[PDB]
Amino acid sequence: LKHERFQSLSFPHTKEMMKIFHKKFGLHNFRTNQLEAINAALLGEDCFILMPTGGGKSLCYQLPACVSPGVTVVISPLRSLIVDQVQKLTSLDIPATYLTGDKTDSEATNIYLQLSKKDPIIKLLYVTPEKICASNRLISTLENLYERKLLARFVIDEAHCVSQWGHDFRQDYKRMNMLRQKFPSVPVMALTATANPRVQKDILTQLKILRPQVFSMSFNRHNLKYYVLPKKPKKVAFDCLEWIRKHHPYDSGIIYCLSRRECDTMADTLQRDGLAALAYHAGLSDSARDEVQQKWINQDGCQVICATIAFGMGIDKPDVRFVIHASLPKSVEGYYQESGRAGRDGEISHCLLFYTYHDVTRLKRTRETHFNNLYSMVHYCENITECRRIQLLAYFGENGFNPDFCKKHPDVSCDNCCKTKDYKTRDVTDDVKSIVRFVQEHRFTMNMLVDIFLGSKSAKIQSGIFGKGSAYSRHNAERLFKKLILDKILDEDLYINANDQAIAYVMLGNKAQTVLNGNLKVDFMETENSSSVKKQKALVAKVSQREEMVKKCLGELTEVCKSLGKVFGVHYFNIFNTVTLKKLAESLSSDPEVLLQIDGVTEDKLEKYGAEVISVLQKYSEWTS
Amino acid sequence: QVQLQESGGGLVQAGGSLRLSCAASGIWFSINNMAWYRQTPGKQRERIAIITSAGTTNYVDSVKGRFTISRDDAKNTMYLQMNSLIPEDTAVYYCNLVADYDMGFQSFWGRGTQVTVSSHHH
Ligand SMILES: Nc1ncnc2c1ncn2[C@@H]1O[C@H](COP(=O)(O)OP(=O)(O)O)[C@@H](O)[C@H]1O
Ligand SMILES: [Zn+2]
């Protein structure tokens, strides 16, 4: 839809809402369907948010919570996710906390104390699903908020967990409907990063949200570079080692393995070559598992985790710079969600799939449908021409996406689109007209036409289009006529002779005439043959004196966040996110009037984290032009 | 001048699926169309699916919907994805390549492979 209705700033809350948006969160401009969804939520509407990873779903309910009487209750599937959000909120001086269960009864009761006072300073109250089900202690508190009209809304994060059709089904999410029974008056809000429409639909039916406002979005991952690479067996680990050290020596990443064993093996092989790799799966003791996620999330002695897909979903950080699938994913849907969680922080990240058909026989060893999905994954890997962004979205039936993306956004081009980045698409409607006219006048096979069009001495006819494509490759000439058959401008019918010998010849297609009228134009891209590709001059843009200083500055800025983290007892990225930091460095300014103009820089954060950051930026004061 | 190597096929229970392959080899050659034939125990060869170099496909009734013919030019390979197999499909399956006009529209054949679809268990 298009929510023109929810786009207005005439609303009563708009004054207060923009105040928190600018001064508390530190943001400047709303992204797609953010203002619309926020407005709607603050009008008491039932909202259903569909946005890809890193879209900006948190703002869609966190901002409304800050500008509402009472507390918003957010259901999350994992305390890890909960902990990260609460850490983000308290870092912005937004009162919030959680009852996951590992909070001792003394602390737990103290929470119930603050909620009972009916003067709560707390806007967000995160909660786990089994807690509501198991603890009848929490319920009797919420009921009191309900009576005083202080239950703002029920936010259901990761809403795809209610569906058995989802990549992560959870039993307790089915029991969330009992929360609405006791509290019907309360606005409900569901968010998910699932692109699967079949799952998206089921969420609403299962959670039984009756005709909500649906805020959808393009599930294209704007900041992910999709790579498929040839998997020469027995040197996967070496290729991961080679790639990582070349592109991301000092950044975190994930390598997905099929088995608990391949995790252990992959981690070992990488380790003995000097890479800080660790294995991550359910086979680990609870002490080990906790130790892995401690080291990886905080970037303390671990760069890469070698995890099973099942277990890798259980933890996350926003600045994952690369995700590698060591084998062949079970499905395209699976692969998209797995590689999608990379680069949540919005910075460029890499998605590398190592492919061999050998893995198919491997993977081969409604289960009939399970085989179908596998082959669709194989089709994705084998397809080395069509833009990989389109291949993924086509699997979900997403409509609207412009195939111009990788060309307009070189920094995040897929490998397929990297091949053709230098080729120019031109209009050849003239030549097509000539061709259609030639065929219309005259029994020719496609190849016969190609020869004539090229100017071969093997050409039967020299009258019409002969030599018209004298500046075409035989490779391109053949591609053009191939294109014309596909685009229905030309057609092909079988001709049989003496003994069942079938020979195809070119005729006009239904879309031929519409070209002569001038209503249809065709665009053709001339490409090199595979055995004819010329190498490219590797030498890249030279660094400038200022560009050298932002790197060094950003480096120091990063450490300041790392230190501030341990001090304030918080993950280093819940201080300043990657984009905020990168932009601070790009300003090189110590002038607070310029810093506050950057996304993520707020008065509170620049007050309690400011001195250290401004200090570093002062050193480069004589470069701030 | 042209060599056709067939792979895939074999014994399989009914309801199962098979994938036949046909790789084309030669120092140089042209392609007008490529077709799959099949020969039941007491019958002659029957063209069941055919594809042209441009991608235009064409099928016979008995296989329509179930069988999908396709070609990869970069690897000069031609497939026939056989779905929903039945004991009637039990036959020898030959690959066929028809060259274009630079050659004499020559027709090259593969040796044939057995697709046996059995009803009972294995
Ligand atoms: N309106 C906005 N303007 C600028 N940055 C934003 C905005 N909304 C969100 N972001 C940034 O996007 C990043 C990820 O958003 P997040 O809430 O994690 O999305 P999701 O929850 O859908 O993964 C955050 O680091 C945040 O700084
Ligand atoms: Zn692309």
Numbering used by the authors:
A (entry chain A): 639 to 1003, 1015 to 1091, 1108 to 1290
B (entry chain C): 23 to 144
What does the paper say about this structure?
In this study we present the 2.8-Å resolution crystal structure of BLM636–1298, in complex with both adenosine diphosphate (ADP) and a single domain llama antibody fragment (nanobody) specifically raised to BLM as an aid to crystallization. Crystals of the BLM636–1298-ADP-nanobody complex diffracted to 2.8-Å resolution, and the structure was solved by molecular replacement. Examination of the crystallographic contacts provides a rationale for the role of the nanobody in promoting crystallization, with specific inter- and intra-molecular contacts mediating crystal packing. The structures of the individual domains of BLM are virtually identical between the nanobody and DNA complexes. However, the relative orientation of the WH domains is markedly different, with a rotation of 90° required to place the domains in equivalent positions. We assume, therefore, that the position of the WH domain in the nanobody complex is different due to the absence of the DNA and, possibly, its stabilization by the nanobody. We note that a slightly better fit to the data is obtained for models where the WH domain is in the conformation adopted in the nanobody structure (Chi2/Chifree2 of 3.95/5.12, compared to 11.9/16.2 for the conformation of the DNA-bound structure), suggesting the conformation BLM in the Nanobody crystals is a reasonable approximation of the nucleotide-bound DNA free structure.
Bloom's syndrome helicase (BLM), like all RecQ-family helicases, acts as a 3′ to 5′ helicase on a wide variety of DNA substrates including forked duplexes, G quadruplexes, 4-way junctions and displacement loops (D loops). It forms a multi protein complex with human topoisomerase IIIα, RMI1 (11) and RMI2 (12), termed the ‘dissolvasome’, which can promote the convergent branch migration and decatenation of double Holliday junction intermediates formed during homologous recombination. At its centre (residues 639–1290) is a catalytic core conserved amongst RecQ-family helicases.
